Amino acid sequence: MLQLWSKFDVGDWLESIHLGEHRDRFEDHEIEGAHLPALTKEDFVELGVTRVGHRENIERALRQL
Numbered sequence: 608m609l610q611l612w613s614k615f616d617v618g619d620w621l622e623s624i625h626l627g628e629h630r631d632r633f634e635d636h637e638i639e640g641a642h643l644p645a646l647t648k649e650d651f652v653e654l655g656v657t658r659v660g661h662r663e664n665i666e667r668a669l670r671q672l
Contacts, residue, residue, distance in 0.1 A: 609672055612640025624668045629656055643669060 612620065614637050618630035632655045638646075646654075651662050 609640045609643065609669075614639050616640060617643065620668075624664060626656075626661055626664065629654060629661070 614634050617638050617640055618627075618634050620640075621627055621630045621633060636654060638654065648662065651665070656662050656665065
């Protein structure tokens with residue numbers, strides 16, 4: 608479950624939803640599962656998720672969780 612994911616698990620989840628291109632930068636920023644729901648648009652841009660569609664897919668995958 609989400610709250611228990613390590614930074615590496617977050618990276619694997621990103622890959623599972625076809626956003627693996629962002630895992631290295633999420634890993635470098637030590638993003639863990641518990642952090643995901645609170646990340647803002649600005650945090651995502653800082654993590655390099657600059658495409659609106661990617662951010663929308665991240666949110667959609669979080670809701671589906």
